[PDB]
Design a protein around this ligand. Structure first.
Ligand code: CU
Ligand code: CU
Ligand code: CU
Length: 59
């Protein structure tokens, strides 16, 4: 079925991998979907990034 491709780039923040994975996970849940693949964007340190892209699919 149709899944949704989403990404966030926030130049005003620099956050851990876990933070961004939580953002992706919770965004999909908010939309009544499940997180499939995801990837970190705009690194700002070792294992810190300024964004994330991810895919949400129907439960
Ligand atoms: Cu973009
Ligand atoms: Cu999971
Ligand atoms: Cu997953």
């Amino acid at each position: 079925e149709a899944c949704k491709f989403l990404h966030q780039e926030r130049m005003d923040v620099c956050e851990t991998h876990l933070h961004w994975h939580t953002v992706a996970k919770e965004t999909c849940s908010e939309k009544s979907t499940n997180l499939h693949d995801y990837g970190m964007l705009l690194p700002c340190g070792i294992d810190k990034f300024r964004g994330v892209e991810f895919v949400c699919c129907p439960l």
